[PDB]
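hey so i finaly got around to running the thing on Neural-cadherin from Mus musculus. pasting the sequence first so u can double check i didnt mess up the copy paste, my clipboard has been acting weird all day
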Amino acid sequence: EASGEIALCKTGFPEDVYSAVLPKDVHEGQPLLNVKFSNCNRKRKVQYESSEPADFKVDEDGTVYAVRSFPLTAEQAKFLIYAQDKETQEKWQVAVNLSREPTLTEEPMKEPHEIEEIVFPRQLAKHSGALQRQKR
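ok and heres what it spat out for the 3d tokens, dont ask me to read them lol
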């Protein structure tokens, strides 16, 4: 942009945390959360692991599924999804927090996606493939 900071690739999580919203009403088959695992190099199947009270499924693609809404009531539920690349002998850890995010702010600056899919819908793209019609 116009500041100059770093330029090295960072495979793994960005040392941050993700937040998934749940009905907190004991509803099972809850939505699926997706972590932003930074990719790089070529081919790197790593191992994943979950640790949430309810039922969760970490997919090698970097997606931990949220199932069962327990406890999720008097407080919030939080767990850590561990990652480990056997190729680069590296490992990462991202904290996902299941909590209610009743935010009214409707003006995203540089981070529209936020594992919420609540405000600012995402279904308005007619263009699907490449059509040649610029002329004639």
